[PDB]
Every structure is written in C-alpha cells, then in structure tokens.
Symmetry: D4
Subunit: 137 residues, 8 copies
DNA sequence: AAAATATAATATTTAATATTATAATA
DNA sequence: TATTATAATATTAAATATTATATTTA
DNA sequence: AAAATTAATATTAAATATTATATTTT
DNA sequence: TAAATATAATATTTAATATTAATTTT
C-alpha cells in the first residue's frame, strides 16, 4: 500500500526513524547502510518503504534506494527469512555484494553477517540461485 | 475506506504506480487500459482506488473511472475471481464490450484474455447474467 | 483510530460519500438524515466518523453530530445489531426519538423501520433499557 | 507504524482526544498525566503515539513524552498487562515513581492504583525487575 | 458427532465423570441433577452426551435424559449463554420447571439460580419464548 | 478420517441417527433415501460416513451406499454448496437421477427440489457438467 | 474429552508410548517418573491422560496417577508454561517435592531441572503459591 | 494421538483404505509400497498411522513399518513438503534408498519421482542434510 | 580445534484448482 | 493438421445460520 | 473498628520448535 | 390476506481470571 514516504526527519533512534509527513510521524525501520546516508534531523528525506501487515501490528521498513526495497521484499518472501534477518543481511553488505555472493555460491561472506548461520546461508543461496538473480538489481 | 486518490504521479513501473498524495506515496496496481491513459511522471492524476484488505497485506487498485472501480468490485466479489483475474479481464476488455460480451453469452471473447480460460469463462457468465444493468 | 474527517465533499453517491481530505478520498457511509443536511459537492464538510475494522475490510461511517456517532457505536456493540441495521435505525429515527422510544419501551415504532422486525425490536429494547439513563 | 502526531487539538473529552492532523482527526487515548499538560482546544499539540492493532480494531495511545511511550510499550508487552492497565499505571504514577517502585520492590505504592491488585502488582514487579535495570 | 456413551462409571469426581467405554475413559461434565441419579462407581450407566468443539478444547457434556441434552444444546446456541451457565440452569431447575418459568415469565425463579443476574435472565426468557413454542 | 460405521441403530430421530459402535453412539445425519432403507431400532446397520470438520463442530454424514458418500463429498467440495444443500439434493432424487440430470443439463428437475433455486441449480450444472465424466 | 486410557502397552520408545485400546493405538507422551513405573511391553496399563488440542495437532499426555494429571493441567494452565516445560518439571521432581518447593519458595531446587531458568523459577513460584489454596 | 491402528482390512480402494477397528472404519492413505504388502480384503492388518490435523480436516496416513512413519513425519515437518509430496517420495523410493540418495546429495533420482522437480529436490536435500543418525 | 552446554531471539500455510507451455504423438 | 499427458506457475482461498422482505399462488 | 464472603464487571487473551551467539570443557 | 418459496442481505467470538463495592458475622 505505502511504497514511499517523503517528509522531514524528526527523530533518529537507530535502527528506527520518525519520518514526519505533514504532521503524521511514521515509525520506519532502516538498515545501517541507509542510516549512514540519512541527513541530520529536521532535513527532508525520501524513503522507499515496504509495509509489512500482520494480525497484530503494521510495520514499515524504509530504504534509500528502490532496488534495496525490492531486494528486501524478495528476501522476506523466503520461508526461513523474516524482516529482521533481511535487514541484517542488507546492513552487513550491499545489494551488489549480495548478488555477487549468490552467483558465486560463497557462504563464508554470509555467515560473517550477525544472525546468519550455515543453514541460513545455504537456504538463501538455494532460494536465490533458483532463478532470482538473473538480472542485476 | 479509501475511494479516491488525488496526487502526483511519482514513478511509473507497470502495472504499479506511486501516487504521491502530499508526501505519502501509495502503491496502486492499475489495468493496462488505465496505464495507457496516465500522464507523464510528475503530473497530477486522479484514480478511483479500491482498497483490498487481507490478513497479511493491504493492497490498492486504482482506475481512471468510477465505473471501472465498480466493475472491479463486482468481479472480485465472485468466489472464483480474484484481483489478478479481474485486472486481466479489465485490461483485455473495456467495460462496454465486456458488458456486451456478458449479455451476449460469448465465451469466445473471454477466452482470448490471458489468464482467462474456459471454466472460469462460463462461471463468470453465469455469475454476471443478472448482476448489473445495461449501463 | 479515526474520529473525525474535515475535508471537501468530492462525490455524493448515497448512501456513500468521498471526502477529499488533502487528496485522500475517504469513502464514508452515512445515514439518510446525515445526507439530507449535507452541502453540495465541492463544499467543506466535517464528519464524526467511526472506523469498523474486520478481517477483510476497513469501513468508515460518518455522522453530522458526535452524539450520533456515540449512538451508532453503542448500537453496533450489541450482539444482533450491525452497521447496516444501526444505519437503518438512525435513518428512520433521530437520536431523540430513538431514546424516547427506548425509555417508553415502544415496539411498533421500531418495527416500522425497514430491516427491523419484532425480535430485533425486542432485542433493542432489552439491550437499551439499562443504557441512556446517564444521558 | 505511527510514532508521533503533530496537529491541532480539535476535541478534548477525557480520556480521549482528537488531533486534527491536516483534516484527519485521529482519536487518541491519553493518561491523566498527559491530559494535565495539553493546552486548550484549538492549540497545536505533539503526542508520541503507539498504535495497537488487533483483529477487530486499530487503537492509538498518545503520550506527551517518548519515555512514557516506551514505558507503555514495555508494559503492554507483558502477558498480563494490556493498554487499559498500563494507562491506569501511568496515570497513577509517573515514570520515575514507577521505576523506583520496581527497583525497590514496593507493592503498597502499586496497589493503591485503581485496577491494580496484589497479584497484578507481584507480576508487574517480577517482570519489570529483569525487563529493565538501567533507567536514565 | 458423539450423542451417547454407554459404558461403566469408572470415576465420580463432581461435576465430572469418567465413562470407561471399552478402555477409553471419556471425561464428561454433568449437572448436579444428573450426578444425583448416577449409579455407584463401577456400574453401567448411559449418558446422552453433547460434544462442544472449540479451537483449543473438545468438551463432553452428559445428561441422563435426551430432552435434557436437547435443552442444553438450545440454551448454549444462544448468544450470551454458555455451557457453564447452561449447566448451572440445568442443575438449578428441571426441564419442566425451566419451561414453565419461560412461559410464565417468572424471572424470580431464574434469578435464584447462582450465576444468573437480571438482564441475562430476561434474555433467556425472551429468546426462549420463540426458540421453543411449548415443545 | 472416518469412512464407515458398523454398529447397531440405537436411536432414530430423523434426519439423525445414533450408531452404538461398541458403546460410543455417533450422531449421524442421513438423507431421506438412506433413512428409508434403515432397519428397525436395535438392528445392526452399516453406514459409509463422511466426517465434516469445522472450527467449532465435528459432523458425521452417513449413507447406505459408498457412491452416495462420494457424490456427497463431490457436492460439498463445490463453491456455494454446503452439507445442507447437498443433503437436500441427495434426498430429493437418486444418484443416478442426479447424474442423468447434470449430464443432460436439465435444470427443471433440480429446481423442483425444495431449497434449490434457478441460480444455484445453474451453478451446480455449470460446476458438475464435466466433473463426473461418466463416473 | 479423554481422561483415561485402559489398554495394553504395545510399543515403548521414550518419552512416548503406544497404548493399544481395542486395536486403536494411542500415542501418549509420559514423564520419566511414569516411565520408571510402567510394566513390560504387552502388559495392561492404565494411564490418566490429558488431551491437549491445538489448531494443528491433538496430543495426549499420560500419567501413572490422577494427581499427576491434575498438577500437569494446572502447570500448563499458566501463561508462560507449556506441555514440554510441565513435563520437564514433573520428570525432574515428584508432585510432593514440587508442591513443597512451591510452598517454601525454593528456586535452587527448580533451576536444577534442565530447561528451567531462573525467571521461570520465580514465575512458577508466584503463580503456584496462589494457585495452591487447599491441596 | 493415533500412532497405530490394528484392525481388519474392510475396503481397499487405493490410495485409500478403510481399516475396520472394532466397527469404526478409518480412512487411511498409504503409499504404493504399502499397497504391495497389504493382505486381501477382510484379513487383519496393522498400520503405523500418522494423524494430520488441519483447521478443517483430520487425516490419517498409514504405513507398514514404523520407520516409514517416522520418515513421513520428518518429510511433512519441512517448510515446503506436504503429505502428498511426502507420499509421492515414499512411493517412488523406499526409506533406505531415499536416505542413501540424500547422503549422496543426488538429485537425478529424486527428479525421476513424479511430482518432484529440481528446485524442490535440492531444497529437500538441503533440509534432510545429515542431521539425523544413519538408520 | 573440536565439540558440548544455556539462552535470547526469530519466524509464523499448505491445498486445491485452473492456465499455459512442452515434448511426444495419431 | 490437431491430441494427450505432464509439468511448472500463479492464483485463490472457507465459511454458515438467521431474520426480513419480495412475487406469486392461491 | 475489623476481618471475611460474595456478585457483578471491566480486561485480556491464550504461542512452540528453530536457530545463532556466547560460554565452557576436553 | 396467508403463507411458499426462494432470495439475498446480514451478522457471525468464547472462556477465564483479577478488581472492587456491598453485605454479613465478629
């Protein structure tokens, strides 16, 4: 439903944000890579958010680039990967690095990311090498 | 709940759009007929959207006309038709000739629509025999 | 969550509305009494809405006055009364007549309301006898 | 999803409010302490809200400070505590008073709060002893 | 699915029983009146059980007479009436006495039953009147 | 899970039965065609049952022939057909007659069945025209 | 629904059992204390089982004594205690020892049980000290 | 809950069975490897069943030997393998060949099984990588 | 190194049915 | 020139009982 | 004052096996 | 005017535990 938020940064409490959009402040969770690029509090920002709807909560996940949001959606669509595991994956390394690892089949880089083990790395490699990285994001 | 969005076209990635309504960009999925009518990116556009609410997602479906939204709601109220099938039906045919086809009991035209086979074709005909008027 | 909408009347298709609240058009269902007091299309309006959330839809119900919204909430809180039946009740009668009938324990007046029968009237009377005392 | 609302106080009937955020009036429930700090109707306000989503309702709970909102979230996160009980706790006591009660393991100060009994106070103490230790 | 159990009374722990139906001991909850008619532990006994199925429990409610089970089913099919309240009503009043009270609108007797207030008694009355038309 | 009950007919309350299978009495609902072929109470009888499981109830439906059970499962698997409509269809006419009617697209015979209208009859014909494929 | 099983011990691989009751082998999970008292395979045994029903599984938990089953039900009735934790508690300690620890508010004894942490220790103490009124 | 059924084979309609356990016939789905070992109709047979409980269905899956039932449980416990796929795998290859092929991480033999592709074969190989002990 | 413990923290749907290709085939 | 089975993809999803009120047929 | 019993009444919600990290031991 | 029969529209949580004011004996 919500695919982009364009407002002013109100509070900066990592990993979360408060993106003030004409009065309504949105609680948006961002990766550390996105955090490293945000301006100072009070400056305008534009995040490509992805809304995760549950039976007990609505959650927003903002990214500085559309490709990042697409990759996050494809990652959370996996059976064993959830929003926070995907966020850790995107924080540990870039999208280009992730696709290079997927097409190279190297679990050493993936296991280096906190929260990612050998089984998780194998599942990620399988489910992405199953024709998801044919075209670079 | 949401019946219309009046903002500016932020970006155009078919079949999806971002409609920047005062900062908040809404992801609306539109038929190809609607896409062939939208202005260039950065210009105002008004869409009559229908909000689909599930247990795990909130989806918006925009249309250039209100009658298209009404027809979409009628189509998705069917037990065998979902948002994707209704979108395919509305992209393949406009409202007028779709109504003509349903009133003419002509499954042939419905079959040519991608994603629409036969069984669903006569199911749609049966369920739309007496659902709407000549319009 | 949403307790009031303050925008401009965009489209008036009874019993539904579209309020262009800074671009976002909220589809609001209102009773006939509320419609009879609405301005023409394009003029500002203020509705005291009540949001009904289900597992497959979000619905908005607007009213001209806050007391009407409160009465609607208490009515739909009942085990046999839903948004449609409550809207019918508030269209047939205003707040004052409804409360006077509840205090007077009148049934024939409630039966005359379309969609309301003998059992519905009895259920309303028994469920509302204790209420409205505080006023 | 919603963590703050900066609008104009349109209506004020306790314990709820109506913040006119650019036309959309959000109905927000606030504790007594927050109500004793809001200006008169028609003046701008800023609440650090917490959106509670259930299977059949979306609810907003506003607070004048972010510390209050964080404490409310931690409280409702408890199994035996819901929004109403947390609001009663926060209305009866401030954040500092509740914190020092938790650290000192005081039940008399918690039972006086309406809606809070002996068993509820015991559960609150046992949970909040380990839920948070260092509070600024 | 289960409408009768014909076994031997293995345990008698009020208000619950254990019917050893060929090895499987079914745990059945019965009214006080039923307990007052059961034989001693180890003797054969037949109960007309009603199976209540929820998302997290399968419960059996046994009765000495079929009419008692029918009345329990009708009572629990109501809105605000449950197996606990229905069992309390059955223990407090016999089937004939309950029917007479329903016909005679004698709420005083119903209020005498523990766990029964005033509004719930009046409800029981009003729904039951047309739920059963004097058998 | 349960596809047959071989016990003794304990009670006969149409359209329901009680099969005393080694002590446990199963509540089984049967069509009129099956009802007419049952023996007297106390005599052994074998029913080919179909267990319907819901979020709040477990229901058994017994038939005198396996083909009847298969047809009932096929009918209730449909979109707008439930156990009640399927049982009405089974009671109204024989399995062979139902197959003949659906193969010949004879709606008039189906309309004569109580509780079966033109719209639902057309739905059944369209959904079962090719399902049987001559068994 | 099921409160006792009286059959024959068919298979015994800990911590689960197969209790052949007239052909139907019920797979029952038992604590180590019950395991140490079971007879050899093929001999009759009576277990006081507790049926746990979930949206996607039906589970049986058998015990050598009724009081053990009552304690298990009380333990799993807690908010933060599940069947696995309750079984670990009952295997690591007897009912008498567990109740004495609850009365004495002893956490050192409880933490010795594998899978039992401190926080769980004082939670169990707080809940059970008030749960046990008479015992 | 049900870990074994010991009755007489009443009806053999592959891939389904009706095992008459003291009157109650149980609908059991078994792999073809079980079909090639069952006795004639009317003869005693023991199956190590596994009960699959859904929101709207209770299902039984029988096997000739316990290790097959264990393997079926492990297979269906996966996040992308269901009872149908597990049954297809067990029918195509026996347990020992299946585990031998998993140890070798060979997909050529898994793809040959009807209903099994390459992606699913690789995923299930990763899932069943050598965690358990060799049979 | 090499494996063996607790413990905090995550993730949370298959089933069935149509539909459109694809390889081999009257 | 069409036919048939298989195979993968991508949807679509499940309610059910109860008042209340319409034409019709007497 | 001085302790106990009780009938409404407003809340509150039921979660279990799988990892991954840290610590510990041989 | 009294139903018959569809006919479609509509509404669809429980139970369990904790609190608290009123009453009764002490």
């Amino acid at each position: 439903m919500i695919g982009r938020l364009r407002g002013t940064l109100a509070e900066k409490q990592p990993p979360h944000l408060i993106l003030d959009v004409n009065g309504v402040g949105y609680e948006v969770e961002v990766p550390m890579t996105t955090l490293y690029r945000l301006p100072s509090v009070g400056e305008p920002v534009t995040l490509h958010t992805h809304l995760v709807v549950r039976e007990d909560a609505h959650l927003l996940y903002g990214f500085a680039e559309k490709r990042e949001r697409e990759l996050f959606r494809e990652l959370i669509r996996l059976n064993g990967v959830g929003p926070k595991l995907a966020l850790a994956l995107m924080s540990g390394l870039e999208v280009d690095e992730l696709v290079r690892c997927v097409q190279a089949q190297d679990t050493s880089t993936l296991v280096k990311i906190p929260g990612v083990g050998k089984k998780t790395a194998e599942r990620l490699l399988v489910e992405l090498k199953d024709r998801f990285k044919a075209w670079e994001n």
